[PDB]
Design an enzyme around this catalytic site. Structure first.
Site, mmCIF file in Angstrom:
data_model
loop_
_atom_site.group_PDB
_atom_site.id
_atom_site.type_symbol
_atom_site.label_atom_id
_atom_site.label_comp_id
_atom_site.label_asym_id
_atom_site.label_seq_id
_atom_site.Cartn_x
_atom_site.Cartn_y
_atom_site.Cartn_z
ATOM 1 N N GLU A 147 0.820 -1.202 0.000
ATOM 2 C CA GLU A 147 0.000 0.000 0.000
ATOM 3 C C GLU A 147 0.864 1.267 0.000
ATOM 4 O OE1 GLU A 147 -2.934 0.673 -0.523
ATOM 5 O OE2 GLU A 147 -4.273 -0.993 0.029
HETATM 6 C C1 LIG Z 1 -8.681 1.659 2.908
HETATM 7 C C2 LIG Z 1 -9.606 2.405 1.993
HETATM 8 O O1 LIG Z 1 -9.847 3.599 2.141
HETATM 9 N N1 LIG Z 1 -10.139 1.710 0.987
HETATM 10 C C3 LIG Z 1 -10.911 2.372 -0.045
HETATM 11 C C4 LIG Z 1 -10.226 2.246 -1.392
HETATM 12 O O2 LIG Z 1 -8.991 2.881 -1.338
HETATM 13 C C5 LIG Z 1 -7.901 2.342 -2.093
HETATM 14 C C6 LIG Z 1 -7.582 3.202 -3.307
HETATM 15 C C7 LIG Z 1 -6.128 2.857 -3.628
HETATM 16 C C8 LIG Z 1 -5.444 3.987 -4.374
HETATM 17 O O3 LIG Z 1 -4.994 4.956 -3.754
HETATM 18 N N2 LIG Z 1 -5.384 3.848 -5.699
HETATM 19 C C9 LIG Z 1 -4.659 4.771 -6.563
HETATM 20 C C10 LIG Z 1 -3.175 4.516 -6.453
HETATM 21 S S1 LIG Z 1 -2.179 5.591 -7.449
HETATM 22 O O4 LIG Z 1 -2.025 6.814 -6.708
HETATM 23 O O5 LIG Z 1 -3.132 5.783 -8.687
HETATM 24 O O6 LIG Z 1 -0.986 4.842 -7.744
HETATM 25 N N3 LIG Z 1 -5.485 2.647 -2.275
HETATM 26 C C11 LIG Z 1 -6.605 2.389 -1.284
HETATM 27 C C12 LIG Z 1 -6.366 1.129 -0.488
HETATM 28 O O7 LIG Z 1 -6.017 0.039 -1.317
HETATM 29 O O8 LIG Z 1 -10.980 2.860 -2.421
HETATM 30 C C13 LIG Z 1 -12.245 2.199 -2.580
HETATM 31 C C14 LIG Z 1 -12.894 2.677 -3.866
HETATM 32 O O9 LIG Z 1 -13.275 4.042 -3.819
HETATM 33 C C15 LIG Z 1 -13.047 2.474 -1.340
HETATM 34 O O10 LIG Z 1 -14.308 1.741 -1.457
HETATM 35 S S2 LIG Z 1 -15.682 2.454 -1.356
HETATM 36 O O11 LIG Z 1 -15.484 3.730 -0.759
HETATM 37 O O12 LIG Z 1 -16.494 1.583 -0.566
HETATM 38 O O13 LIG Z 1 -16.086 2.456 -2.750
HETATM 39 C C16 LIG Z 1 -12.348 1.877 -0.119
HETATM 40 O O14 LIG Z 1 -13.104 2.213 1.028
HETATM 41 ZN ZN LIG Z 2 -3.957 1.471 -2.015
#
Ligand SMILES: CC(=O)N[C@H]1[C@H](O[C@H]2C[C@@H](C(=O)NCCS(=O)(=O)O)[NH2+][C@@H]2CO)O[C@H](CO)[C@@H](OS(=O)(=O)O)[C@@H]1O
Ligand SMILES: [Zn+2]
Ligand SMILES: [Zn+2]
Ligand SMILES: [Zn+2]
Ligand SMILES: [Zn+2]
Ligand SMILES: [Zn+2]
Ligand SMILES: [Zn+2]
Ligand SMILES: [Zn+2]
Length: 327
Positions: free
Chosen positions: A83
């Protein structure tokens, strides 16, 4: 399903030995090209796990103990690696923050407050306990399936549920591996599994894990509101940077809007537990060692004459801990 006893603890070599003892996902893994693909990335890019582990040494003992207490898969102790590289300052494009990469809305659900002074998502203890509660709740929503729970942690419970339903309608199986998820989420689960396979048997892959002791790195110490981290650093002869890395929630490096508690290095815990009431939320000047009227006057852009006029000195020779009024 092993339940961990603290009487096992003195026999572990280091944190990695202890962590593996609590792994619960290894048996039910299997051949999937998607796992091998992630594993090869780790084997070809070893500095990632190495640098994550160095930063991890501040936090990993804490995370492992919380997972053991709840009898949750110790593979989740590796989730901050994928993460955030165990960097509590990491911020994604989605504004995911802290070790566990909570987005703002999910952080708010778990009452991880976000103010000008404090971001609970970065708070090591608060964000860890919220992440484990969220993962447990997701696990419970998906009938005990850790693969779907991890998928939902990344993509949201909604996304995963709709994907399951869509497969049901098409008459396809609805296990994680068969759901056509966004690429990030397709990669998320096999990435964690791959990493856990290497941590489980690093010698078999020619990997050397960073040596990390099986000891606490920090202790929580009661602190008043409105103390500067610099003041604590000076009191305890610590690097302010270390205190900030242990207390990343405090955006302005002052204890406000948070738990009224500092994580501090073990070696200074006794001293600070005894000492932290002497610091007060903060005209008056406390005479240091090596100070004279002249040096003090120079620092404050005043004259020696003005400084003597503002005080009632027996002599010019100052004593350490003496109080002076600055005009
Ligand atoms: C721990 C957390 O906050 N999890 C959330 C997650 O985050 C993810 C997003 C991801 C992230 O930051 N992705 C982009 C990465 S980068 O910057 O593009 O490389 N990291 C976090 C944990 O895995 O996004 C989903 C979808 O919105 C959320 O689900 S929802 O709200 O129920 O729909 C969920 O709650
Ligand atoms: Zn993430
Ligand atoms: Zn049991
Ligand atoms: Zn055990
Ligand atoms: Zn379970
Ligand atoms: Zn130290
Ligand atoms: Zn003047
Ligand atoms: Zn003297």
């Amino acid at each position: 399903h092993h339940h961990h006893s603290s009487g096992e603890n003195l026999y572990f070599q280091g944190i990695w030995d202890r962590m593996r003892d609590g792994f619960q996902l290894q048996d039910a893994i299997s051949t999937n090209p998607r796992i091998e693909r992630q594993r090869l990335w780790f084997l070809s890019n070893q500095s990632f796990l190495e640098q994550s582990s160095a930063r991890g040494s501040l936090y990993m003992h804490y995370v492992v103990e919380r997972l053991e207490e709840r009898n949750m898969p110790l593979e989740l102790a590796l989730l901050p690696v994928i993460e955030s590289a165990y960097n509590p300052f990491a911020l994604s494009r989605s504004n995911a923050a802290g070790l566990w990469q909570f987005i703002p809305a999910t952080g708010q659900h778990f009452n991880l407050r976000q103010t000008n002074f404090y971001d609970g998502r970065r708070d090591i203890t608060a964000s860890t306990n919220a992440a484990l509660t969220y993962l447990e709740r997701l696990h419970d929503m998906f009938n005990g399936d850790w693969m779907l729970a991890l998928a939902a942690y990344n993509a949201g419970e909604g996304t995963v549920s709709r994907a399951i339903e869509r497969n049901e309608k098409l008459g396809l199986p609805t296990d994680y591996w068969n759901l056509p998820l966004p690429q990030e989420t397709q990669d998320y689960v096999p990435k964690l599994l791959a990493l856990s396979q290497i941590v489980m048997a690093p010698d078999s892959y020619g990997i050397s894990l960073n040596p990390i002791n099986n000891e606490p790195y920090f202790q929580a110490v009661r602190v008043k509101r409105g103390i500067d981290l610099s003041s604590v650093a000076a009191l305890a002869n610590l690097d302010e940077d270390e205190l900030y890395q242990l207390n990343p929630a405090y955006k302005r490096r002052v204890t406000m809007d948070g738990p009224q508690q500092l994580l501090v290095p073990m070696e200074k815990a006794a001293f600070l537990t005894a000492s932290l009431d002497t610091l007060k939320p903060k005209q008056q000047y406390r005479v240091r060692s090596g100070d004279s009227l002249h040096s003090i006057a120079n620092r404050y852009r005043i004259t020696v004459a003005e400084l003597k006029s503002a005080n009632r000195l027996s002599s010019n020779h100052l004593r350490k801990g003496q109080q002076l009024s600055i005009p």
